[PDB]
Amino acid sequence: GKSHGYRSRTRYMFQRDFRKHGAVHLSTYLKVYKVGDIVDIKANGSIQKGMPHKFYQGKTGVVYNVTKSSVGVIINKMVGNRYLEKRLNLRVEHIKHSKCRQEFLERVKANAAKRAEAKAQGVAVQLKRQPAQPRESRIVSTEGNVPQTLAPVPYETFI
Amino acid sequence: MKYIQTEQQIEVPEGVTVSIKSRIVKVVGPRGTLTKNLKHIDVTFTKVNNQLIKVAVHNGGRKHVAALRTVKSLVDNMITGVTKGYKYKMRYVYAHFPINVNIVEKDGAKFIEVRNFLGDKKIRNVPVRDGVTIEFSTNVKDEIVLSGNSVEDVSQNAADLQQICRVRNKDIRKFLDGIYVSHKGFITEDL
Amino acid sequence: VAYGYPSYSTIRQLVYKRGFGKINKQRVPLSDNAIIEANLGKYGILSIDDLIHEIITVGPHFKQANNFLWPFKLSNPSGGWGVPRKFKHFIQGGSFGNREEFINKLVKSMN
Amino acid sequence: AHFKEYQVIGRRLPTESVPEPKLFRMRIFASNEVIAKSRYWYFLQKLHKVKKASGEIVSINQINEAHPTKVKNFGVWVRYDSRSGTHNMYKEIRDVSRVAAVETLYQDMAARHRARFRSIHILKVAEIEKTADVKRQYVKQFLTKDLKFPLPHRVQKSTKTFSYKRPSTFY
RNA sequence: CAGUCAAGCGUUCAUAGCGACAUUGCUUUUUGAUUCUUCGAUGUCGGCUCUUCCUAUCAUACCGAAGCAGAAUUCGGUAAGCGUUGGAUUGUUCACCCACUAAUAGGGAACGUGAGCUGGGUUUAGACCGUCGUGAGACAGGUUAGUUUUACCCUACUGAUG
RNA sequence: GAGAACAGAAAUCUCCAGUAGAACAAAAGGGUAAAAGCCCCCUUGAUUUUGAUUUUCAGUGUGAAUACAAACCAUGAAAGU
RNA sequence: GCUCGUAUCAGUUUUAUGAGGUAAAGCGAAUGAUUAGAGGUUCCGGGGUCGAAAUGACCUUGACCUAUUCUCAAACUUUAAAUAUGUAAGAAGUCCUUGUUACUUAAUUGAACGUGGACAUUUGAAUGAAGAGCUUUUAGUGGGCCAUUUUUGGUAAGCAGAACUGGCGAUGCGGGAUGAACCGAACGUAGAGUUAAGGUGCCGGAAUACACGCUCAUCAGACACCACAAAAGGUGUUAGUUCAUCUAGACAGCCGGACGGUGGCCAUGGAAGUCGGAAUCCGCUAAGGAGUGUGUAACAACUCACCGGCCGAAUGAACUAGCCCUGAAAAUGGAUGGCGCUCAAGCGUGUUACCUAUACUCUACCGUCAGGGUUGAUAUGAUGCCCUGACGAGUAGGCAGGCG
RNA sequence: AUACUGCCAGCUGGGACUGAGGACUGCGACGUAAGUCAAGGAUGCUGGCAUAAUGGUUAUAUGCCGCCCGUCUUGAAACAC
């Protein structure tokens, strides 16, 4: 009848890549993970041990444990009307550092520097981010930019 | 597309007079007087110099500018009938049974009587319209002449004879029997 | 929704007529500068026209002033909507969307 | 309602690589400024690679008719979509202003081809004042020398339901 | 059941009459598909009887067209006004023959019509046979016998007073 | 593909191309090239104790699987597995 | 109810950062299908020649090659969206001779957890937050059905089965005549005003309004869901491209027809053209041919190709799509809701005015919830008196105040 | 000059509905003075009747609405019970 296996409907998900098959490059093994690191999950179809489930493919979690060849990840999974905490033991081939946290740490350092400059002078550094504001007034000239009048084109078959 | 102004010219000979009230045309001339009602046409008339009359339609569609020239031709017909008249000559076509035509008067009405059409015992009676004169033309066998002023009544009497002489239950491609109009012309032609 | 760019005139009329503040989760009519000062004086907004100015010339405390302003309960437009059917875009001959500056006419009709 | 004509000038959003883009202009017949800007962006999206998000509108101006109380002939090239295909048509009309010319052109398209506003592109409105350039007979008909016509069958409107004498349609 | 296009048939000739390969459709007189109503029951097959309706017209009225000479036919139009039978066999609907006829057209009305009939069939219980089953028993297989209730009410109808 | 003597389109086949078009017990899909394929050498980690975790999930069971701990082993020069 | 009191939040956006393999696209990219078209030693499907013999010699599918795009894929794909989706945007945070350890390191190198220090009026996007964290316990339910959308089976179904959703059930109200689900809008009792959807000839409240067109039907048409119509047609009518010309004049009808050397091509039954091939010698002109058709075979036998007079300035061919018509046949009598309507009261479109929902605005009153005030010498049993702001649909079901 | 938009804390009218609250309290306005006011909710004047006149109840008539309850059910006025 019906089939719901562990790797059910993962035909394209774990498919390796185009012209990226075979042995994996060594930077993934050289990367180190500490407790509290934020990691993206993307299973390597080539390595079959410690492979995450198709649910956790594409999920971002927090490291809670570090072992010989793998790492423990905390993922909040929506079960019904709540989130449950799920602990995965995934290999570094399927684990990868998440860049959102890295960008935020860089911003934290930038705010620290701007606050130091504010303590130096006091020039209203305005740490907080702002959305894209509406454009202010501007003046557009016509030197070599005289408006070119356009008109709707008549219909043609073209075939 | 609402043509703004369409007008035609009806020519009036030197002997006839057209008296036109709202839409009642009366043409008088040497032969007689002919009257026609045109209240259904919605047209206008304007006499120019007593020799031409302009018949006009303002802001008319296709179906109105058609009727304009139609009534111009009808007035042509009345003037031509009052000047020269209309003469419809019809011949008798028969293979075996000769058509016997007579003019009879039941209560004085000048019916045309057709007998022996394909040799049947029925006599075909057709009345004659007022102003239509019947003449059994000599010098030609089996010819009848219908003469008058109103081409409408003359042609309708000719059509009445032709229609009453229809062949039934036979192949009319072979049974060519009947009275057919062979000439449509004028009483005073070439005068 | 129907939205657009309100003018100083329409904003002042909105605040003066249908102007209610949110004080301790309660909708109280402005009707006096005392309560506006009491609830927005930390930000320098000491009058109804101070609040109007903060709303119009969108200021540093626009968020606080606007949130203090209770949502405006407008009536139906008094001259109608000007369209047979509302729930088409303003471009399509409807009502919804961005009537860039015609929101002033619409809102002054509803207010 | 009443159509107006707007000149709408807009450009692509200036980038550092290319400051001052080419700043194209159109003439848009529209009900108001909002619809004028919307139609400008519609046609710009149809011609060049730009949309409202990726560009800006630098000018919108009402073009009033030069002499709005003189009678001239208008040739309107339009493109419209039927229930089956797309067709270009050319019609000639008579009005005092271009905006009313386009308004009655839209009425005419709706009446004769059931073409709604959405399915019509006004390719061009050109004013011709010289005859023998007019090609439509329904305009050449009123282009007649010393033209004069009557208005037969005048129907007079009555505010009271009942009339006490039989009406006359003389004019 | 009806169209559209015509490769061809029709000695010549696509369209008098047809018409392949394709293709567009029409109330459901078939039969399916569905399971919405009814299982504190809407009496079932056919026939008989009787009224009415539809038209996609068999005949009759009047016409158009033919590969319509005449007779006889065939194809169409307006047309449901008016008719559309008697029988052998079968419970039959359909059949199929004998005839008459102007013609023996097709259908609907809760597959019209059982407090209208009938009860031949189907469809309880009796019984026989064949095949099947160890058996009890089964078999839209065949045979034979098998209770057909009530209106006096309201409407409708038909007549009758007032 | 060019090849030997019987010998042939399909033995024995030396080179040249060869991204896997092969093979991997089986269904299909994924995966794999100095290998996960084919040979060769060694072997019994298909071992012990009990926990944690993922899937189905009620976050119950069953089945399967994942990463460790503490042992005892195999293999390798070793890292390791 | 408990612990607290505006935050250890959010069916939302933004910024930053992942994941995907559907739509689309692609097939002179892999797999698999798939139509055509040049040249290839016949040891390498089947067919004749110099002749007792084959590489000194040609055509028929293409086996096998040549990179030429004819067309495709739910179980094919290099590429690859939109929508939806994971995480982060801080005080449990960011940076320092350090302190602990049996883990880890060659090593006070790391790992984890810290003591001591620097961060304020912006504590590190937006919007909101009619309070936030739940604890216990228990009812009913566990037949569902219907939308626009994505979609499977089926010819299809008011069929059967699944998609982020919204509804009916469980729900009245205004509109769609009528209708569980459509549109509008959700409901305390009243009053004014304004509206939504839908409408304004009369039924019927509200313009027989205004404006431009189109349409005449001997089955008109009349507003979504929805209560149906098609292919094919029509000098019905309306609106939309090219060719000949336009002072070198553009159709239809009434009347005329034609030259000189040319009179060369079939058996001995017949061509200036009709079952027939070679095409270039000269001509003053307002009209004239080695040649364009219906079966006496031969000059005479019925037309023309440039043509001319007539109260001469546009016609001819194809096509597109609006309304209308044909296509258009079912049973009791009959339904744009009815009457009726024809420069509409029909169809397309465009201002505007007007009508009216239990909706919106504003008032009164009722109740519920909540946030508060209130210790006063008598005349008040302090949720007593009072200030308040918001809210009110409801089956199954729960709970509370009461009435008998 | 007029259009057409926009603004006026610009002026002049014509109608309708409502009048909650009830012993000083507040915010304001008026030549900046005691006072006044349209400023935290209607007062002033006047008439008729003092009764079935208003009103309640009740029966009918009229206009517009209104299907038979209970139940099972996705769905009941049901030609379901």
UniProtKB/Swiss-Prot annotation, chain A:
**The keyword ATP-binding is annotated on this UniProt entry:** no
List the subcellular locations: Cytoplasm
| InterPro entries registered for this protein in UniProt | Ribosomal_eL21 (IPR001147), Ribosomal_eL21_CS (IPR018259), Ribosomal_eL21_sf (IPR036948), Translation_prot_SH3-like_sf (IPR008991)
Q: Which PROSITE patterns match?
A: RIBOSOMAL_L21E
Asked whether the keyword Kinase is assigned, the reply is no
Which Pfam family, giving just one, matches this sequence?
A: Ribosomal_L21e
A single cellular component GO annotation: cytosolic large ribosomal subunit
> What Gene Ontology molecular function terms does this protein carry?
structural constituent of ribosome
Q: Which GO terms describe its biological process?
A: cytoplasmic translation
| Major localization listed first in the record, in broad terms | cytoplasm
Positions of crosslink type Glycyl lysine isopeptide (Lys-Gly) (interchain with G-Cter in ubiquitin): 31
The UniProt keywords, alphabetically, are: Cytoplasm, Isopeptide bond, Ribonucleoprotein, Ribosomal protein, Ubl conjugation
Q: Which family would the database say this protein is a member of?
A: Belongs to the eukaryotic ribosomal protein eL21 family.
Other facts noted in the record for this chain: There are 2 genes for eL21 in yeast.
Q: Which PANTHER family does the protein's record reference?
A: 60S RIBOSOMAL PROTEIN L21 (PTHR20981)
Q: What does this protein do?
A: Component of the ribosome, a large ribonucleoprotein complex responsible for the synthesis of proteins in the cell. The small ribosomal subunit (SSU) binds messenger RNAs (mRNAs) and translates the encoded message by selecting cognate aminoacyl-transfer RNA (tRNA) molecules. The large subunit (LSU) contains the ribosomal catalytic site termed the peptidyl transferase center (PTC), which catalyzes the formation of peptide bonds, thereby polymerizing the amino acids delivered by tRNAs into a polypeptide chain.
Instruction: Specify the protein name.
Output: Large ribosomal subunit protein eL21A
Q: Which organism is it from?
A: Saccharomyces cerevisiae (strain ATCC 204508 / S288c) (Baker's yeast)
Curated annotation (Swiss-Prot), chain B:
* Locations listed in the record: Cytoplasm
InterPro entries noted in UniProt: Ribosomal_uL6-like (IPR000702), Ribosomal_uL6-like_a/b-dom_sf (IPR036789), Ribosomal_uL6_a/b-dom (IPR020040), Ribosomal_uL6_CS2 (IPR002359)
Q: Which UniProt keywords apply?
A: Cytoplasm, Ribonucleoprotein, Ribosomal protein
Q: Name one Pfam family in it.
A: Ribosomal_L6
Summarize the subunit comment.
Component of the large ribosomal subunit (LSU). Mature yeast ribosomes consist of a small (40S) and a large (60S) subunit. The 40S small subunit contains 1 molecule of ribosomal RNA (18S rRNA) and 33 different proteins (encoded by 57 genes). The large 60S subunit contains 3 rRNA molecules (25S, 5.8S and 5S rRNA) and 46 different proteins (encoded by 81 genes). uL6 lines the binding pocket for eukaryotic elongation factor 2 (eEF2).
- What does the further note read? Present with 52400 molecules/cell in log phase SD medium.
Name-wise, this protein is: Large ribosomal subunit protein uL6A
Query: Whose protein is this, by species?
Result: Saccharomyces cerevisiae (strain ATCC 204508 / S288c)
Q: Which gene encodes it?
A: RPL9A
From Swiss-Prot, chain C:
Write out the annotated subcellular location.
Cytoplasm
Specify the domain of life of the species encoding this protein. Answer: Eukaryota
Q: What does this protein do?
A: Component of the ribosome, a large ribonucleoprotein complex responsible for the synthesis of proteins in the cell. The small ribosomal subunit (SSU) binds messenger RNAs (mRNAs) and translates the encoded message by selecting cognate aminoacyl-transfer RNA (tRNA) molecules. The large subunit (LSU) contains the ribosomal catalytic site termed the peptidyl transferase center (PTC), which catalyzes the formation of peptide bonds, thereby polymerizing the amino acids delivered by tRNAs into a polypeptide chain.
Miscellaneous? Present with 101000 molecules/cell in log phase SD medium. There are 2 genes for uL30 in yeast.
Task: Describe, as the record does, how this protein assembles with itself and its partners.
Answer: Component of the large ribosomal subunit (LSU). Mature yeast ribosomes consist of a small (40S) and a large (60S) subunit. The 40S small subunit contains 1 molecule of ribosomal RNA (18S rRNA) and 33 different proteins (encoded by 57 genes). The large 60S subunit contains 3 rRNA molecules (25S, 5.8S and 5S rRNA) and 46 different proteins (encoded by 81 genes).
Similarity annotation: Belongs to the universal ribosomal protein uL30 family.
Q: What is this protein called?
A: Large ribosomal subunit protein uL30A
- What's the source species for this entry? Saccharomyces cerevisiae (strain ATCC 204508 / S288c) (Baker's yeast)
Q: What is the lineage of its organism?
A: Eukaryota, Fungi, Dikarya, Ascomycota, Saccharomycotina
Curated annotation (Swiss-Prot), chain D:
Keyword Lipid biosynthesis among record annotations: no
Modification type Phosphoserine: residues: 31
Q: Cross-referenced Pfam families, in alphabetical order?
A: Ribosomal_L18A
Q: What main location does UniProt list?
A: cytoplasm
Citing just one GO molecular function, the answer is: structural constituent of ribosome
Identify the keywords attached in UniProt to this record, alphabetized. Cytoplasm, Isopeptide bond, Phosphoprotein, Ribonucleoprotein, Ribosomal protein, Ubl conjugation
Quaternary structure and interacting proteins, as annotated: Component of the large ribosomal subunit (LSU). Mature yeast ribosomes consist of a small (40S) and a large (60S) subunit. The 40S small subunit contains 1 molecule of ribosomal RNA (18S rRNA) and 33 different proteins (encoded by 57 genes). The large 60S subunit contains 3 rRNA molecules (25S, 5.8S and 5S rRNA) and 46 different proteins (encoded by 81 genes). eL20 forms multiple interactions with RNA and proteins in the central protuberance, connecting components of core functional centers that are located far apart.
Q: What is this protein called?
A: Large ribosomal subunit protein eL20A
